[PDB]
Amino acid sequence: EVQLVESGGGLVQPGGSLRLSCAASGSISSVDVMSWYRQAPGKQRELVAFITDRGRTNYKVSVKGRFTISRDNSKNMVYLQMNSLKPEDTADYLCRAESRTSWSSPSPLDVWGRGTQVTVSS
């Protein structure tokens, strides 16, 4: 079972950029979905972006056009490039690996990282 560790968090000015990394302990090329989530104090955890095994991506409406999720299979990495950051993007960002039960993967996969802290503030 893969293990996930996030890095790249920090503080940045509104309008600024950050790049987060989700490092997996092994190949994630076969994982149905790799996701980035975020959670701010007192709020629900929110799905921000995902990339499928086949490379299809989608985005939370509020970040579309300024965030990009991508993957490097040779490095077992998933990245979240964040641009034009707003105070409302402040949160702990966490990655997740999910695969539903299937014939070739009878055991379900649902693994979370511990998170990296993003603060958008002046």
Residue numbers in the entry: 1 to 82, 82A, 82B, 82C, 83 to 100, 100A, 100B, 100C, ...
Please, what does the article write about this entry?
The trimeric HIV-1 envelope glycoprotein (Env), composed of its receptor binding subunit gp120 and the fusion protein gp41, is the main target for neutralizing antibodies. Because Env gp41 contains highly conserved sequences that are exposed during the conformational changes leading to membrane fusion a considerable effort is underway to target gp41 with a focus on the membrane proximal external region (MPER). Llamas (Lama glama) and other Camelidae produce classical antibodies as well as heavy chain-only antibodies.
We determined the three dimensional structure of the VHH and mapped its interaction site to an MPER region that overlaps with the 2F5 epitope.
